[PDB]
Each structure stands twice: as C-alpha cells, then as structure tokens.
Design a protein around this ligand. Structure first.
Ligand SMILES: [Zn+2]
Length: 46
C-alpha cells in the first residue's frame, strides 16, 4: 500500500478556483486565466 501525505507548504497566495499555492501575487494571477475559459462544452445562454 501507500500512505504518507507530506506535501505541505503553507503558501500565502492561493487560487480561488482550486486553492493552489503560490509565492507571489503574480504567478497566481496568471494561473487564474487558465480557469476562466475552457473548451467549448456547455452553452450557457444569457
Ligand atoms: Zn486554480
């Protein structure tokens, strides 16, 4: 079997979409763009 979660960091910056962990207020802002915008799936009419 496998066990031993030792992947902690306590980063100050975190994504509001997944909760990632960054170090600067820039790298996190860029990773966000990835969230806002995905393949053409689910026509959300408006
Ligand atoms: Zn994210």
């Amino acid at each position: 079997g496998s066990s031993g979660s030792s992947g902690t960091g306590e980063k100050p910056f975190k994504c509001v979409e997944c909760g990632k962990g960054f170090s600067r207020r820039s790298a996190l802002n860029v990773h966000h763009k990835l969230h806002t915008g995905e393949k053409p799936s689910g026509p959300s009419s408006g």
